[PDB]
Design a protein around this nucleic acid. Structure first.
Ligand SMILES: Nc1ncnc2c1ncn2[C@@H]1O[C@H](CSCC[C@H](N)C(=O)O)[C@@H](O)[C@H]1O
Lengths: 61, 58, 72, 118, 235, 25
RNA sequence: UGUCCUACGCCGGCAGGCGCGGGUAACCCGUUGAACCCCAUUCGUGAUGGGGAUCGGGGAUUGCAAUUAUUCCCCAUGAACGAGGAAUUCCCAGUAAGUGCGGGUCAUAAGCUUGCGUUGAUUAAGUCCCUGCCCUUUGUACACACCGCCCGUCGCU
């Protein structure tokens, strides 16, 4: 199912060339879940994202 | 600056082959004369045929 | 393959355009050219010919793009 | 399709290797495409192939009129070589089906390329 | 930058890409030229109609060359659109819509030779998660080694983006049973940098003492051309 | 601290880099 | 920028000729009437009115001298070229790119190299994956070194 979720805080640029951003993401329908996601493109606090499959958390060192 | 780029790109090619070789032995069993001093390119010779490079596989 | 758009109107083509063109909801030399197999000059000339009879409504005109619509 | 290529064909399935050959052929559209007759290629492909594969594939493709044994020679018998050249290199089954005997997976010959996907 | 970097080979080479491929004049020229060097580099029996395997036929450009030389062949391709336009070009050799990394489905010892023009550089990039570059290359090379008549050479024209690509290809080939090497025709030349993995299936003592005394830090005679030279015969 | 080492090894560094790129009368 | 830059008048269709003026210069070319751009016409997916190379003839100009075409003008011919397997260059805002105009080299080139304006963006505000350079620690891994095998068989003088 398609899910929607607000960015809370950005953790920082991740990836080999710094092409992704690791970020703290929380849902709006239930403002209790809190996940780590990695995104492509410029992000800031207050952006809201369309998550296709909202189970796993992103992971990069 | 692009010359050093190209030259040690070829050097890394050679080193990665030479470091492939020992685990290749363990787990299992180039244009030098054709280089032109005056210019970048590939000059024909009469004693030897048209330019090539043979790197044998083990 | 190679397009073979006609340069002067045949009888059947002229009849079907005179009874079909004033209701497309889009009248432009390119679209009538591609659906009637007509070279663009002949399609253009037919379009101001149909505008001359009052059957066709112009909405804007340009040196690159002139666009029409039906009356009602 | 060429009969020689399909009768040297096998199955790429991991389990059935390497004994899944031969394929059991099927035909629904047969055409004849002319191919240059080089008798050297014929005389070199004659010792290569199993002839019982020709028997079973021709019986799959409804045809019986083939030589029953290995026709070995110095390219002097024009009529055997010509007919068997017609059978392999010129008879083309444009549309058809294939099934592996040891897996059952289906491969459609669809004008005129069979499919070999997972 | 690179067609390979785009992504999955089938998805990249769609109907649009296939149309532009045969429309490209360079493609026609460079591919026929590379197939000529390929058939020459692999030492096929002279004056003998051969039986090669087109591992990357695509539009049937290399295949049409083999047809003109009189060598019958079988094509293999992951792009459906490219194989459609290859059969629209009416090539003599048979075609087969299959994956190289998956495995070539022919009797061990069937093809006397194999032509692969720009197709093996696509096997070093995992386009899917299940895809494993090393495994895919190895499986393909092992299948080719068996399918190829033990002894016949399989020329493999490739376009490496780095040394890691070449390294992987070579290791997975040598451990599969493929022996030979790589002929980089015109290696210095960049527009003619053609990598073809040909793979068949079958006084000095006085100088040292003076340097010793120099390192010991005492006064040493300056080094000239008369350092060690026989003054005379001795009776 | 072992918790700090594991958390820092599992997270990404961020922050410090200063890039220098680029009327009244 | 200019004592070769040129206004103006006449002739020729065009390269170009004749005469008469200004400028040693924010004074004259020059209110530098530039090109892209804008408006209107024709062309219709066709190696075609796209593309212009290579050629045939004629005219003019600079020079002692133009032949192997100095250059320019007119008429004719309309080649490859269908967006480039593959190596790679430069670049973060009036910037890239599109588009014209000047200076130096010059009896005449256009072709180099330097500047200028006009129209005006896509992506990005990051990283050490490749490359270059700089540091710190280290010489423990691999290599070099050390030891060992140092290829075996028969045949005559
Ligand atoms: N795993 C794979 N299995 C089969 N074909 C593959 C493949 N990876 C790439 N290819 C093929 O590689 C080709 C690249 S182009 C090959 C055609 C060749 N240059 C010629 O014209 O002669 C594509 O046609 C694609 O189908």
């Amino acid at each position: 199912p398609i899910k929607l979720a607000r960015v809370t805080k950005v953790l920082g640029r991740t990836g080999s060339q710094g092409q992704c951003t690791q970020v703290r993401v929380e849902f709006m329908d239930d403002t209790s879940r809190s996940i780590i996601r990695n995104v492509k493109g410029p992000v800031r606090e207050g952006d809201v994202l369309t998550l296709l499959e909202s189970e796993r958390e992103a992971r990069r060192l | 600056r692009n010359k050093k780029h190209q030259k040690l790109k070829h050097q890394k090619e050679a080193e990665e082959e030479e470091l492939e070789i020992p685990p290749q032995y363990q787990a299992g069993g180039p244009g030098a004369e054709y280089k032109a001093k005056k210019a970048k390119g590939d000059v024909k010779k009469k004693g030897r045929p048209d330019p090539y490079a043979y790197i044998p596989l083990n | 393959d190679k397009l073979n758009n006609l340069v002067l109107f045949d009888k059947a083509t002229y009849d079907k355009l005179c009874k079909e063109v004033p209701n497309y909801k889009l009248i432009t030399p390119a679209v009538v050219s591609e659906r009637l197999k007509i070279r663009g000059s002949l399609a253009r000339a037919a379009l101001q010919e149909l505008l001359s009879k009052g059957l066709i409504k112009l909405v804007s005109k340009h040196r690159a793009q002139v666009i029409y619509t039906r009356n009602t | 399709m060429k009969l020689l290529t399909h009768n040297l064909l096998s199955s790429h399935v991991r389990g059935v290797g390497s004994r899944g050959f031969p394929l059991r052929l099927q035909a629904t559209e047969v055409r004849i495409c002319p191919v240059e007759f080089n008798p050297n290629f014929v005389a070199r492909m004659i010792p290569k192939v199993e002839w019982s594969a020709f028997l079973e594939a021709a019986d799959n493709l409804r045809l019986i009129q083939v030589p029953k044994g290995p026709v070995e020679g110095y390219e002097e018998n024009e009529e055997f070589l010509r007919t068997m050249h017609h059978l392999l290199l010129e008879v083309e089954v444009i549309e058809g089906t294939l099934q592996c005997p040891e897996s059952g997976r289906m491969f459609p010959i669809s004008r005129g390329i069979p499919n070999m996907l997972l | 930058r690179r067609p390979e970097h785009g992504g999955p080979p089938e998805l990249f080479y769609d109907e649009t890409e296939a149309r532009k491929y045969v429309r490209n004049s360079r493609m026609i020229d460079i591919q026929t030229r590379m197939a000529g060097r390929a058939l020459e580099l692999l030492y096929l029996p002279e004056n003998k109609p051969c039986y090669l395997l087109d591992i990357g036929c695509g539009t049937g450009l290399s295949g049409s060359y083999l047809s003109d030389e009189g060598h019958y062949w079988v094509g293999l391709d992951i792009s459906p659109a490219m194989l459609d336009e290859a059969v629209d070009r009416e090539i003599e050799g048979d075609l087969l819509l299959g994956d190289m990394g998956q495995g070539i489905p022919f009797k061990p010892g069937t093809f006397d030779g194999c032509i692969s023009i720009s197709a093996v550089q696509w096997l070093c990039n995992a386009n899917k998660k299940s895809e494993n570059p090393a495994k895919r290359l190895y499986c393909f090379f092992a299948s080719l080694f068996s399918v190829l008549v033990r002894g016949s050479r399989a020329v493999l024209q490739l376009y490496p983006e780095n040394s890691e690509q070449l390294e992987l290809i070579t290791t997975q080939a040598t451990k599969a049973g493929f022996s030979g090497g790589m002929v980089v025709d015109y290696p210095n030349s960049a527009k003619a940098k053609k990598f073809y993995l040909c793979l068949f299936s079958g006084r000095a003592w006085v100088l040292e003492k003076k340097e010793r005394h120099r390192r010991q830090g005492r006064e040493v005679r300056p080094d000239t051309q008369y350092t060690g030279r026989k003054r005379k015969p001795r009776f | 601290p072992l918790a700090d080492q594991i958390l820092a090894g599992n997270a990404v560094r961020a922050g410090v880099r200063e890039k220098r790129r680029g009327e009244e009368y």
